[PDB]
Design an enzyme around this catalytic site. Sequence first.
Site, PDB file in Angstrom:
ATOM      1  CG  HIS A  79      -2.163  -0.951   0.950  1.00 42.68           C
ATOM      2  ND1 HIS A  79      -2.320  -2.116   1.671  1.00 42.68           N
ATOM      3  CD2 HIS A  79      -3.194  -0.914   0.071  1.00 42.68           C
ATOM      4  CE1 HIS A  79      -3.409  -2.745   1.262  1.00 42.68           C
ATOM      5  NE2 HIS A  79      -3.957  -2.038   0.288  1.00 42.68           N
ATOM      6  CG  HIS A  83      -1.984  -0.045  -4.378  1.00 42.17           C
ATOM      7  ND1 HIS A  83      -2.631  -0.895  -5.253  1.00 42.17           N
ATOM      8  CD2 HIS A  83      -2.938   0.434  -3.542  1.00 42.17           C
ATOM      9  CE1 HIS A  83      -3.918  -0.939  -4.949  1.00 42.17           C
ATOM     10  NE2 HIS A  83      -4.129  -0.141  -3.916  1.00 42.17           N
ATOM     11  CG  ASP A 120      -5.029   2.426  -0.554  1.00 43.65           C
ATOM     12  OD1 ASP A 120      -4.823   1.500  -1.376  1.00 43.65           O
ATOM     13  OD2 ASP A 120      -5.925   2.375   0.317  1.00 43.65           O
ATOM     14  CG  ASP A 223      -8.363  -0.820  -4.422  1.00 44.57           C
ATOM     15  OD1 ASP A 223      -9.123  -0.733  -3.425  1.00 44.57           O
ATOM     16  OD2 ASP A 223      -7.126  -0.709  -4.323  1.00 44.57           O
TER      17      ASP A 223
HETATM   18  C1  5BA Z   1      -0.668 -12.502  -1.730  1.00 42.58           C
HETATM   19  C2  5BA Z   1      -0.681 -12.881  -0.374  1.00 42.58           C
HETATM   20  C3  5BA Z   1      -2.040 -13.269   0.166  1.00 42.58           C
HETATM   21  O1  5BA Z   1      -3.039 -12.354  -0.161  1.00 42.58           O
HETATM   22  C4  5BA Z   1      -4.369 -12.547   0.165  1.00 42.58           C
HETATM   23  C5  5BA Z   1      -4.754 -13.566   1.041  1.00 42.58           C
HETATM   24  C6  5BA Z   1      -6.111 -13.752   1.354  1.00 42.58           C
HETATM   25  C7  5BA Z   1      -7.086 -12.890   0.793  1.00 42.58           C
HETATM   26  C8  5BA Z   1      -8.565 -13.068   1.102  1.00 42.58           C
HETATM   27  O2  5BA Z   1      -9.358 -12.179   0.802  1.00 42.58           O
HETATM   28  C9  5BA Z   1      -8.991 -14.376   1.725  1.00 42.58           C
HETATM   29  N1  5BA Z   1     -10.353 -14.637   2.178  1.00 42.58           N
HETATM   30  C10 5BA Z   1     -10.595 -15.927   2.783  1.00 42.58           C
HETATM   31  C11 5BA Z   1     -12.042 -16.244   2.979  1.00 42.58           C
HETATM   32  N2  5BA Z   1     -12.802 -16.163   1.751  1.00 42.58           N
HETATM   33  C12 5BA Z   1     -14.265 -16.085   1.889  1.00 42.58           C
HETATM   34  C13 5BA Z   1     -12.160 -15.381   0.727  1.00 42.58           C
HETATM   35  C14 5BA Z   1     -11.424 -14.218   1.310  1.00 42.58           C
HETATM   36  C15 5BA Z   1      -6.689 -11.871  -0.087  1.00 42.58           C
HETATM   37  C16 5BA Z   1      -5.344 -11.673  -0.387  1.00 42.58           C
HETATM   38  C17 5BA Z   1      -5.046 -10.578  -1.368  1.00 42.58           C
HETATM   39  N3  5BA Z   1      -5.530  -9.330  -1.199  1.00 42.58           N
HETATM   40  C18 5BA Z   1      -5.307  -8.386  -2.119  1.00 42.58           C
HETATM   41  C19 5BA Z   1      -5.850  -6.946  -1.892  1.00 42.58           C
HETATM   42  C20 5BA Z   1      -7.202  -6.870  -1.302  1.00 42.58           C
HETATM   43  C21 5BA Z   1      -4.807  -6.086  -1.179  1.00 42.58           C
HETATM   44  C22 5BA Z   1      -4.551  -8.696  -3.315  1.00 42.58           C
HETATM   45 BR1  5BA Z   1      -4.216  -7.377  -4.702  1.00 42.58          BR
HETATM   46  C23 5BA Z   1      -4.096  -9.993  -3.457  1.00 42.58           C
HETATM   47  O3  5BA Z   1      -3.377 -10.369  -4.573  1.00 42.58           O
HETATM   48  N4  5BA Z   1      -4.356 -10.909  -2.499  1.00 42.58           N
HETATM   49 MG    MG Z   2      -7.507   1.099   0.808  1.00 43.87          MG
HETATM   50 ZN    ZN Z   3      -5.897   0.292  -2.698  1.00 43.21          ZN
END
Ligand code: 5BA
Ligand code: MG
Ligand code: ZN
Length: 296
Positions: A79, A83, A120, A223
């Site tokens: 962030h 980004h 952000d 985003d």
């Molecule tokens: C890469 C390292 C791990 O990253 C993540 C790990 C878990 C999640 C989740 O949203 C997991 N949960 C788990 C439960 N489920 C109902 C789905 C939502 C998102 C992320 C994630 N968020 C984001 C953004 C929201 C910052 C990005 Br861009 C991304 O590539 N992955």
């Molecule tokens: Mg934000």
């Molecule tokens: Zn953002």
Amino acid sequence: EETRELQSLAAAVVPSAQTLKITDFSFSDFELSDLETALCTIRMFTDLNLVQNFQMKHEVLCRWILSVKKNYRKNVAYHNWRHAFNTAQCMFAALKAGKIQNKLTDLEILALLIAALSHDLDHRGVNNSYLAQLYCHSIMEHHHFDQCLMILNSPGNQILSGLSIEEYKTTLKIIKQAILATDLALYIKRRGEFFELIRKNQFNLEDPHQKELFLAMLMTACDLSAITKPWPIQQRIAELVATEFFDKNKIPSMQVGFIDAICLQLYEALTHVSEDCFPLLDGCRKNRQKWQALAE
Ligand SMILES: CCCOc1ccc(C(=O)CN2CCN(C)CC2)cc1-c1nc(C(C)C)c(Br)c(=O)[nH]1
Ligand SMILES: [Mg+2]
Ligand SMILES: [Zn+2]
């Protein structure tokens, strides 16, 4: 060092959108210096006709871009300014290559680009709670908007000075809703209605209520747009996210879950609104396959 950066930024030639690859959905910033990202940002404003239509002075826009960049934290793995910059490039690409531009007003486009860049501001990392307490209502997004507003009001940084007070208020409101929309909680709450409307071919941009909903969905789409990138790029951005999330073997199934739960339906919905945003959805599906294969 600051006027020097401003002097140098203001004196530079701004290469074409084509030269800068800024119209590509598969765009990546890894090979660019901060100066170069500042130049890409100018190009985005100019080629969306914002500099022209709103009488922005060159040095004011330059100073504004530098103020925004400076108000992200370098020490925060994901962030940060890159980004925001990437979020705005995706906005630019969806407007141009995605042919979203024709569906929107000039003021809406102005607000969205500023929002994308500003959404952000001053972020301290997902694991940081710096608080005065008091739960949600999108507290972080309110802070980002507040920072956006302060920069827009700063001496020498007023890129909106060319608007009338009525235009100004209307755009500030769009910017505020747009930034507030990047709260994933608001996205999840408002999602269903958007999907429901498309599900029945009921979706209509002429209705102000639906216009506003679409702008919110569009913000989220940009985003999250790192998960739509070519595999070598997504792998790298995921490295940054993982670093901030824990400031690695469970990561593949997390990413698949994230894509399924939050991303796929959004990009499918966006592609319905505009066929030409398909490469975002295509890229997202391609990353699901790569992550899933790793998950074993
Ligand atoms: C890469 C390292 C791990 O990253 C993540 C790990 C878990 C999640 C989740 O949203 C997991 N949960 C788990 C439960 N489920 C109902 C789905 C939502 C998102 C992320 C994630 N968020 C984001 C953004 C929201 C910052 C990005 Br861009 C991304 O590539 N992955
Ligand atoms: Mg934000
Ligand atoms: Zn953002």
